[PDB]
Amino acid sequence: GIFFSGGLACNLTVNAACGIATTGDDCPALYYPPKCNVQVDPLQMNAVISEIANAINAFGNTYDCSRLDNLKQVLNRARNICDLPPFGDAPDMDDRIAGCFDGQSSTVTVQQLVNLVLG
Amino acid sequence: GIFFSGGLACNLTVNAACGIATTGDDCPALYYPPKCNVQVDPLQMNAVISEIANAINAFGNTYDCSRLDNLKQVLNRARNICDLPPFGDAPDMDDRIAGCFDGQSSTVTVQQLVNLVLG
Amino acid sequence: GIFFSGGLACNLTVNAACGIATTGDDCPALYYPPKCNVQVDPLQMNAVISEIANAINAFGNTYDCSRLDNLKQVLNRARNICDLPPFGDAPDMDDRIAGCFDGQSSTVTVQQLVNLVLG
Amino acid sequence: GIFFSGGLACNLTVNAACGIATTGDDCPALYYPPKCNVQVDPLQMNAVISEIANAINAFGNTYDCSRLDNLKQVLNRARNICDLPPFGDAPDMDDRIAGCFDGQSSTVTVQQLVNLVLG
Amino acid sequence: GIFFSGGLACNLTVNAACGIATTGDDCPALYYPPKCNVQVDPLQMNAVISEIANAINAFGNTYDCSRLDNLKQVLNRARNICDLPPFGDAPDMDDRIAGCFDGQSSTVTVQQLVNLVLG
Amino acid sequence: GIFFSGGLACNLTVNAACGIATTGDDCPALYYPPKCNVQVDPLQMNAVISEIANAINAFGNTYDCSRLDNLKQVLNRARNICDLPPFGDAPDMDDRIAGCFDGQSSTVTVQQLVNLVLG
Amino acid sequence: DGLSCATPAQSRVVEERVTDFVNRLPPSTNLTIDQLRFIGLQVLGPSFNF
Numbered sequence: 001g002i003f004f005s006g007g008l009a010c011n012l013t014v015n016a017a018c019g020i021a022t023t024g025d026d027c028p029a030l031y032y033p034p035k036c037n038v039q040v041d042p043l044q045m046n047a048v049i050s051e052i053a054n055a056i057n058a059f060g061n062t063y064d065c066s067r068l069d070n071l072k073q074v075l076n077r078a079r080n081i082c083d084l085p086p087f088g089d090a091p092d093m094d095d096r097i098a099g100c101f102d103g104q105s106s107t108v109t110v111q112q113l114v115n116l117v118l119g
Numbered sequence: 120g121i122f123f124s125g126g127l128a129c130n131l132t133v134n135a136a137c138g139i140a141t142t143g144d145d146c147p148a149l150y151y152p153p154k155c156n157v158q159v160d161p162l163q164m165n166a167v168i169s170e171i172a173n174a175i176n177a178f179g180n181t182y183d184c185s186r187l188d189n190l191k192q193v194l195n196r197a198r199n200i201c202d203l204p205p206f207g208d209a210p211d212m213d214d215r216i217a218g219c220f221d222g223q224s225s226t227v228t229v230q231q232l233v234n235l236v237l238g
Numbered sequence: 239g240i241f242f243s244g245g246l247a248c249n250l251t252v253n254a255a256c257g258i259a260t261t262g263d264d265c266p267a268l269y270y271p272p273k274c275n276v277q278v279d280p281l282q283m284n285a286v287i288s289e290i291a292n293a294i295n296a297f298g299n300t301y302d303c304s305r306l307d308n309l310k311q312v313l314n315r316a317r318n319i320c321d322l323p324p325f326g327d328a329p330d331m332d333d334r335i336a337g338c339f340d341g342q343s344s345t346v347t348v349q350q351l352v353n354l355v356l357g
Numbered sequence: 358g359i360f361f362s363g364g365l366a367c368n369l370t371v372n373a374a375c376g377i378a379t380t381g382d383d384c385p386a387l388y389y390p391p392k393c394n395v396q397v398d399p400l401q402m403n404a405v406i407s408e409i410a411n412a413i414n415a416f417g418n419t420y421d422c423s424r425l426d427n428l429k430q431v432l433n434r435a436r437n438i439c440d441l442p443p444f445g446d447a448p449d450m451d452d453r454i455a456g457c458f459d460g461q462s463s464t465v466t467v468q469q470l471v472n473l474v475l476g
Numbered sequence: 477g478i479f480f481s482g483g484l485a486c487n488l489t490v491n492a493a494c495g496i497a498t499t500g501d502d503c504p505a506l507y508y509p510p511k512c513n514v515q516v517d518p519l520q521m522n523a524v525i526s527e528i529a530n531a532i533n534a535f536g537n538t539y540d541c542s543r544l545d546n547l548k549q550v551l552n553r554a555r556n557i558c559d560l561p562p563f564g565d566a567p568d569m570d571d572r573i574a575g576c577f578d579g580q581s582s583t584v585t586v587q588q589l590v591n592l593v594l595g
Numbered sequence: 596g597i598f599f600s601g602g603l604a605c606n607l608t609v610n611a612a613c614g615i616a617t618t619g620d621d622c623p624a625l626y627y628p629p630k631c632n633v634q635v636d637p638l639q640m641n642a643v644i645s646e647i648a649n650a651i652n653a654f655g656n657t658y659d660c661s662r663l664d665n666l667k668q669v670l671n672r673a674r675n676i677c678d679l680p681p682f683g684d685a686p687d688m689d690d691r692i693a694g695c696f697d698g699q700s701s702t703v704t705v706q707q708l709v710n711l712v713l714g
Numbered sequence: 715d716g717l718s719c720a721t722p723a724q725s726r727v728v729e730e731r732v733t734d735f736v737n738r739l740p741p742s743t744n745l746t747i748d749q750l751r752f753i754g755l756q757v758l759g760p761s762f763n764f
Contacts, residue, residue: 001134001303002287006715011371014391015239015281017187017288021295027303031287032280034392039763040159040278042151043134047306049121049150050136051290052170054310059317062140065120068166068255069173076177078317079197081217081336081343087225091235097218097227098200098319099345100334105200106325107219114236116329117352120253136306155719155763159278161270162252168240168269168282169255171289176259184239184265185368187285191292198297198316200336206344210354216337217319224319226337233355264366358544358610359525371519374526374663378533384541386529389518397521399627400610402635404544406597406626407612408528409646412547414616416555422596422622425493425642426649433653435554435673438693439576444701448711454694455557456573457583457677463563464695467711473567474590474712477660478644491596491642497652503660507644508637516640523663527647531666535674544612554674558695574676575692576702582682592686593709 002047003030121166126150240285245269358404360387361397478523483507597642602626716763728757 007030010018016031032038056063056070059077063070077083096107126149129137135150151157175182175189178196182189196202200217212233215226245268248256254269270276294301294308297315302308315321329348336345360377364387367375377386389395413420413427416434420427434440450471453464477498483506486494496505508514532539532546535553539546553559569587577584602625605611615624627633651658651665654672659665672678686692688709691702717725731753739745754764 001301002290003303013281013284014369015187015284015288017292020291021300023300023302027301029291029301031284034281038280040280040283042157042159043132043153045159045164046132046134046150048167048286048290050134050306051309052121052167053139053148054136054307055313057138057140058310058313062142063120063146064142065122065146065166066142068169068253071170071174072177074313075174075193075197078313079178079202079343081203081226082215082338082341083343084217084224084226086215087218087220087223087227089220089223091227091231092221095218095220095227096320096324097216097335098322099217099329099336100201101325101329102327102333103201104325105198105322107319107322108325108329110235112329116348117236117355134306161276161278162272164278164283165251165269166253167286168242169253169258171240171286172258172267173255179259181259181261182239182265183261184241185366187288188292190289191296194293194296194312194316198322200322200345201334203336203343203345206339206342206346206350208340209350210339210346214337214339216335218337219320222320224317229351229354236355358541359528360541370522372523372526372663374529376533377529378538380538380540380542384539388522388525391519395518397516397518397635399633399635400608400629401521401525402639403608403626404610405525405528405643406599407544407610408547409597409643410615410624411545411612412551413646415548415551419616419618420596420622420624421618422598425491425645428646428650429653431551432650432669432673435551436581436654436679438557438574438581438679438702439579439691441555441693441700441702443691444696444699444703444707448696448703448707452694452696453558453560453562454573454692455560455676456567456571456586457675458563458567458571459565460677461563462560462674462676464557464560465563465567469566470586471712473586474593477658477663478647480644489638489641491638491645493645493649496648497657499657499659505648505658507641510638514637516635516637520644521640524643524647526663527666530664531670534667534670544610550670554670555700557674557693557700558698560674560695572677572681573692574679575686575690575705577682577686577690578684580682581679583677583679584682584686588685592688592705593712 001027002044002051003028004032004041004044005030007031008033120146121163121170122147122149123151123160123163124149127152239265240282240289241266241268242270242279242282243268246271358407359401360385361389361401362387364388365390477503478520478527479504479506480508480517480520481506484509596622597639597646598623599625599627599636599639603628719763720758724757728754731757 010016013031013034018029020029022029052071053063056074058074061074091110094109094111096109098105098107101108129135129148129150132150132153137148139148141148172182175193177193180193210229212230213228215228217226248254248267248269251269251272258267260267290309291301294312297312299312331348333348334345335348335351367373370388371391373388379386389397410420413431416431418431448467450467452467454467454470455464458465486492486505489507489510492507498505532550534550537550567586569585571586572583573586573589574581574583605613605624605626608626608629611626617624648658651669653669656669686705688705691704693702696703717728732750735753736745758764
């Protein structure tokens with residue numbers, strides 16, 4: 001993947017953060033050694049570029065290199081609620097509604113809210 | 120941008136994801152070729168560095184080089200509802216509320232909310 | 239960090255974001271100069287790989303090297319609300335409810351909604 | 358002396374300790390970089406030997422080459438209040454007595470305990 | 477920890493105090509072997525100097541790089557019960573007072589003191 | 596011991612503390628020289644490890660490898676009274692009690708305090 | 715890594731030589747990266763990525 005297959009572990013180099021949960025040993029977390037002669041692999045830069053690009057094209061947005069801050073816009077559209085499309089239908093039985101309940105962000109049902117507002 | 124200037128298409132190389140949406144026939148989707156004497160372009164790497172840096176500075180946060188998870192904290196603050204600051208005033212009849220609706224995550228206006236609860 | 243150590247300022251190269259907010263002179267924003275006798279520093283690349291790895295690992299997701307849209311799915315799960323876990327405890331009076339307010343992505347306490355719905 | 362002259366900062370190394378309160382700015386909490394072929398400076402070891410020797414020499418004790426628990430003995434002498442010298446003459450009313458009052462180790466005036474016992 | 481990773485057992489070397497109590501076999505106590513081709517691990521020296529730094533900041537005192545007696549000063553402050561903070565409120569029966577009883581440093585409550593003196 | 600076997604006098608090098616009390620000249624205090632290169636002796640580092648580890652295990656505590664503040668905890672255990680265990684029997688007239696007297700960390704026996712109470 | 719850029723003869727002889735070197739390494743001696751890298755350099759040339 002984005003990891004150099006002929007690489008090392010975290011404690012065997014620098015600027016490498018281990019503890020990377022992976023879907024098995026076949027895609028191990030390996031990094032470049034701290035030598036002055038090794039060269040960055042192009043067929044890894046491809047994977048990093050693919051990651052960033054697939055991130056940018058999320059939500060239907062389109063990439064554009066005239067703006068070096070595309071991922072910033074994607075993050076903003078990911079957090080800002082307003083960006084969400086208005087619910088084009090009348091509300092109903094238990095359409096869950098989100099919020100920082102008791103400290104943890106989670107969702108509650110409609111009936112759970114009417115239970116407290118009826119009281 | 121972040122793509123290689125004289126690269127190839129998606130299917131002529133490896134670790135190259137296509138379906139990338141770009142604006143116009145310029146700024147195309149070109150990745151590194153699988154050849155022996157191709158090295159990663161510094162100017163092209165500057166684009167990736169700038170994209171990551173601008174992704175870090177979302178939400179006004181500042182980037183520190185000592186830690187290797189700034190993007191993780193930014194992406195956490197994205198989903199952490201509790202992050203959202205309190206609203207400076209009282210709501211009204213037209214404001215929208217976040218929430219899911221039959222697998223159609225959206226917003227609901229206080230109008231239909233009060234209409235359903237008043238019944 | 240992810241910036242090139244021996245690099246130049248943003249305005250002295252190409253594809254270099256300007257105005258990146260660091261956390262002090264300690265971590266300066268420097269990019270690869272437009273010269274020829276310069277190669278991508280493997281350690282600087284380790285930094286970027288680690289950043290993307292942490293971003294993928296966020297939200298309890300695991301990395302897969304067979305897919306090139308991991309960060310994209312992480313962003314989608316960040317935006318989607320039904321991905322948020324359901325809540326079991328009864329919402330006390332002082333919870334938070336999120337939604338649009340005067341064109342702003344914020345939240346209000348349950349007090350505001352109940353006092354409005356009284357009317 | 359300690360805090361190796363050409364060292365890095367808190368997170369840039371391994372096993373570093375953070376938060377180090379230092380008089381002035383020219384005495385930075387530095388740590389050996391974790392790279393290839395770095396050797397610890399003799400002078401630093403000289404400073405650490407000086408610190409440990411002064412700590413052992415404290416309380417008027419002397420150092421022994423045949424014993425490897427001198428600092429432990431000095432720490433024991435710091436505790437075990439029975440090593441403190443007796444008071445030569447009769448005490449006065451404004452003296453202070455040590456005790457752990459309401460879960461915090463403090464001192465109280467003799468007048469207070471006399472008023473308490475007379476009650 | 478501050479021990480050497482690939483060191484030897486307690487009695488297989490010199491200048492080793494063994495019987496060291498550690499939490500868990502996972503991190504044993506291993507000392508540098510007596511081989512002429514071994515170099516001290518700079519990470520281990522980082523751990524040692526980090527321990528000394530954490531110790532030197534105790535009691536609120538800050539570290540000074542110029543002067544070299546600091547651990548002696550902290551130890552003196554430890555055996556300086558005169559430097560203890562005076563109590564603001566009045567002690568009660570449930571409070572504790574320390575002294576040398578039957579030769580051992582221990583504590584007793586003020587209630588025992590008044591019971592003894594009233595007899 | 597923790598000194599350098601083939602070192603020089605304190606005044607001849609830097610970062611060296613002079614006046615260190617030792618049991619005779621057979622255990623001299625010597626330091627690494629600033630002149631022609633010398634590598635730190637691994638056995639001397641073993642001695643320092645031994646000293647620190649013995650200091651940690653005092654007061655019945657055990658060494659931890661996950662964190663790096665152990666000596667700070669030990670120094671907190673010193674100078675903190677009530678940690679001192681309570682006395683099983685009743686305070687006899689002969690025993691001594693602690694307390695700062697005339698600005699001196701001295702002790703006084705129960706006879707004098709009982710006489711002050713009765714007087 | 716990087717051995718697929720060379721002709722099959724060079725790849726085969728480099729693998730044979732590195733196997734031979736590691737198998738004949740005396741006890742109590744470090745297996746450094748520089749030695750394997752020299753074995754590869756002496757066959758592939760000095761401007762080869764390996």
